[PDB]
Design a protein around this ligand. Structure first.
Ligand SMILES: CNC[C@@H](O)CN1CCCc2ccccc2C1
Length: 332
């Protein structure tokens, strides 16, 4: 399963998909170059460098030595880019997992792009935090912090489409076969899929809750289990069909903080946004409070189980769902 995960990152087409996200690439370049004093003549560790583009940005900012660590066979293409760019003196590509490789020295700054869907998908943040064993005291992290946002949404058409799909199985004679006994299992399977898509911000029914991970302070085991209580104060009346998720990360440099946002108010990125449906919708009047917990539990497939319990406090109407982020539905 981890084998499949790294093979995916060995394709230049996948690297190209990430590089052509101008929000992503341009913000990292701004973050590094406009904080050139965090890089001028320092030692840099680039965790999961892929083609090496962030290592070149750190070179452009004046770093004297960058260790670029990469587990996929993309590391071979990265070394070709270091030669052809005449940077063999300053960029050393180290093939392997950051947990296994040897660094020759401690570093001043760690750079990486370890954000998956919903921030945490693919569990790359664990490698990122694990690399802190090479960070000097008062070293920096780029990105420095991550904010997950949660917000309730209404989207009757997204909810209904799940049943339209599963009702294929509610047929007493599909070519003469009664399929209806599998309707519930099919419904169950569709609702366990987080929906990757963007959406109009007017579907949001309350201001988002924010959960912050400080990468300078977090330990790797802090990401095995992530409990996010929420209390939403409903700004609109309607049926809540589930929770929408997006994230921001900040690069907190000596000169300035640069923000990379995937919010639905911001230009689209290849992370889009993520929505998780409730099993049953919940009615809330403007002014009601929607309260509950989102519990992320790391699983065997480099991903998370998502457990969401929610209730309308004024009413007692409760709903839940348990989702698996490894099998998302790409609706865009
Ligand atoms: C370097 N690490 C970036 C990774 O975190 C980006 N990921 C974003 C989610 C979707 C996606 C689409 C195409 C290629 C890769 C990915 C994964």
């Amino acid at each position: 399963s981890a084998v499949q995960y790294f093979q995916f990152y060995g394709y230049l087409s996948q690297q190209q998909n990430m590089m052509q996200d101008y929000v992503r690439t341009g913000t990292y370049q701004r973050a590094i170059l406009q904080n050139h004093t965090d890089f001028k003549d320092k030692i840099v560790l680039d965790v999961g460098c892929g083609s090496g583009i962030l290592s070149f940005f750190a070179a452009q900012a004046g770093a004297r030595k960058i260790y670029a660590v990469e587990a996929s066979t993309m590391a071979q293409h990265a070394e070709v880019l270091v030669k052809s760019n005449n940077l063999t003196d300053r960029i050393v590509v180290i093939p392997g997992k950051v947990e296994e490789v040897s660094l020759p020295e401690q570093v001043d700054i760690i750079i990486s792009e370890p954000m998956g869907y919903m921030l945490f998908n693919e569990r790359m943040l664990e490698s990122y935090l694990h690399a802190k064993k090479y960070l000097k005291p008062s070293g920096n992290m780029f990105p420095t912090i991550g904010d997950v946002h949660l917000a309730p949404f209404t989207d009757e058409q997204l909810y209904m489409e799940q049943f339209t799909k599963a009702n294929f199985w509610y047929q007493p004679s599909f070519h003469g076969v009664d399929l209806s006994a599998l309707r519930g299992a099919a419904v169950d399977e569709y609702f366990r899929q987080p929906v990757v898509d963007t959406f109009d911000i007017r579907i949001l029914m309350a201001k988002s809750v924010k959960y912050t991970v400080n990468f300078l302070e977090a330990k790797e085991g802090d990401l095995h289990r992530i409990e996010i209580p929420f209390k939403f104060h409903m700004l609109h009346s309607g049926l809540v069909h589930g929770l929408a998720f997006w994230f921001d990360v900040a690069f907190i440099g000596s000169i300035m903080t640069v923000w990379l946002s995937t919010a639905p108010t911001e230009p689209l990125t290849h992370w889009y946004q993520v929505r998780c449906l409730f099993q049953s919708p919940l009615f809330a009047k403007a002014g009601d409070t929607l309260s509950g917990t989102c519990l992320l539990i790391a699983n065997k497939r480099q991903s998370y189980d998502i457990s969401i319990v929610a209730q309308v406090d004024q009413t007692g109407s409760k709903s839940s769902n348990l989702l698996d982020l490894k099998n998302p539905f790409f609706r865009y």
